[PDB]
């Protein structure tokens, strides 16, 4: 068995290792990635998503989130408050302002135990969940908006064709924005690239030990817990890895820089943070692996999670039992 420890993967892909998305997906699984949860891709020096940064002041974030947390300084969970409209280069420019900027730190290890310590005693504001892509049209590798998608693998592997589409999303960060734990909707893998800007670190549990985060999560979060028997999915609990370490929870960390993909393969449970004013974009994919893991995902039909559209047919044809119940949250 290939990464038996379950330890975060780095790859390097040559150019030409590049062109063909899935094969090379399939080739990090063959080398046991998928075990970890997350995998780490360095493209190529031949390689960029764009020509420049340097013209993207001008998009509009229509409803940045102020992150206000509750709890404990390992345990705690946020909300997302509405604030008024901002352009990307208001936002930059808030995120660099003394009340929200990086503190002076020695390395990303101190800036890991400030975060921890600290955290709960601000609210930074997260421009989140902004469809579009910073990808240029000729970028014909890992382009992000230029995947296959996840209908299409779906009616290639079992012969249903259905309705939806499967389009990215942009991510403005600053410093102590914050991602809660969970995996994505119907167990999907995801794909992350950072754009431009300061660091993202990532929490993961390997999805064979996704159950024991779980049961750590209903003990921690026990109101939650009895609100919604997947309360993870409304994506909102911390916990530190200090209170992972104590309660004996497998994980593993890693910080992602500018420049550099990250995967979440299905049921891999995750959560980080970024350092500073920063700017990513991801999307949620599928391979013919996949399909067994969202047959068996759990769902929230407590009202909480509301999502896509395009996450209905997913649940009709792969989970017709849950179907109607389902529906009735989302109704
Ligand atoms: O970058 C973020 O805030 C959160 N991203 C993800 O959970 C992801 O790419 O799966
Ligand atoms: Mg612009
Ligand atoms: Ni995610
Ligand atoms: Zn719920």
């Not at 150019?15 to 997350?38: C, P, T, V, W």
């Amino acid at each position: 068995a290939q990464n038996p420890n379950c330890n975060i993967m780095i790859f390097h892909p040559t150019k030409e290792e590049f062109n063909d998305f899935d094969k090379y997906i399939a080739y990090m699984e063959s080398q046991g990635a998928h075990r970890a949860g997350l995998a780490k891709i360095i493209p190529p020096k031949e390689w960029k998503a764009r020509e420049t940064y340097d013209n993207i002041s001008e998009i509009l974030i229509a409803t940045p989130l102020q992150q206000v947390a509750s709890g404990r300084a390992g345990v705690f969970t946020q909300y997302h408050k509405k604030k008024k409209a901002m352009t990307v280069g208001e936002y930059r420019h808030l995120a660099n302002s003394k009340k929200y900027q990086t503190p002076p730190h020695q390395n990303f290890e101190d800036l890991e135990r400030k975060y921890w310590k600290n955290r709960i005693y601000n609210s930074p504001i997260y421009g989140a969940d902004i469809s579009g892509s910073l990808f240029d049209e000729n970028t014909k590798q890992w382009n992000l908006g230029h995947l296959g998608t996840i209908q299409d693998l779906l009616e290639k592997e079992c012969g249903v064709v259905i309705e939806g589409v499967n389009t990215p999303y942009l991510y403005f960060g600053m410093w102590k924005t914050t991602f809660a734990w969970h995996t994505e909707d119907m167990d999907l893998y995801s794909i992350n690239y950072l754009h431009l800007g300061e660091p993202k670190t990532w929490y993961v549990v390997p999805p064979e030990h996704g159950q024991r985060l779980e049961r750590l999560a209903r003990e921690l979060f026990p109101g939650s817990s009895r609100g919604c028997g997947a309360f993870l999915r409304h994506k909102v609990a911390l916990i530190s890895p200090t209170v992972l370490k104590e309660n004996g929870i497998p994980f593993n960390r890693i910080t992602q820089e500018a420049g550099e993909f990250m995967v979440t393969f299905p049921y891999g449970y995750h959560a980080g943070f970024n350092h500073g004013f920063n700017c990513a974009e991801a999307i949620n994919f599928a391979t013919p692996r996949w399909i067994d893991y969202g047959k068996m995902a759990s769902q929230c039909s407590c009202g909480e999670a509301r999502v896509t559209f395009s996450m209905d047919a997913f649940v009709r044809i792969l989970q017709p039992e849950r179907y109607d119940l389902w529906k009735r949250g989302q109704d």
